């Protein structure tokens, strides 16, 4: 439960593969939710400084 919900808090798509650790069946699921822009861009970070 916590890993499924953290997968969509982290990226926004549940993408389990046939070579996952705890996928012995090897199912292929690319459940995509289409969260629009998952990350806000910064060309420079807060701790970036000069002078």
């Amino acid at each position: 439960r916590r890993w499924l919900t953290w997968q969509v808090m982290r990226t926004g798509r549940i993408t389990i593969q046939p070579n996952d650790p705890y996928n012995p069946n090897g199912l292929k699921y690319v459940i995509d939710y289409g969260v629009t822009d998952i990350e806000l861009p910064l060309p420079q970070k807060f701790d970036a400084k000069d002078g």
């Binding site: 798509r13 699921y29 690319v30 459940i31 995509d32 939710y33 289409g34």
Partner: protein
Amino acid sequence: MDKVKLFQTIGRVEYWERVPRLHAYGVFALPFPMDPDVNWAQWFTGPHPRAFLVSIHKYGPKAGHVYPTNLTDEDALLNVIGMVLDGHDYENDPNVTVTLKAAVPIEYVQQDPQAPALQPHQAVLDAAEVLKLKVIKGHYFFDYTR
């Protein structure tokens, strides 16, 4: 994608409004039977209002039936009887109310079925002299009564 399908449209009604005309010009429309050879489906398909031009069979076996004119045949040019306004139920009625006298804007007449919607069809304007159309401002003036 796989187990969650996102929002995705099913259908699209695009309700338009019917072709206007001059109040102060009058109107004179007559019912005609329709030529069954020509595919009247693919003329009345679009939701946008159009007004194409029809021509009668002056002689021949299907005389009295009307077909939409093709701008290369001279017999359809010399026998144009009017335009059909906004729409008509083709599949549930084999007859048509053809307006023989009206005053339609030039934006709303498209001779080919696969024409740009709400655009002045240039091949109609280029040959409007033979078709007895007298463009004045932005409108076609026509009566095929004589």
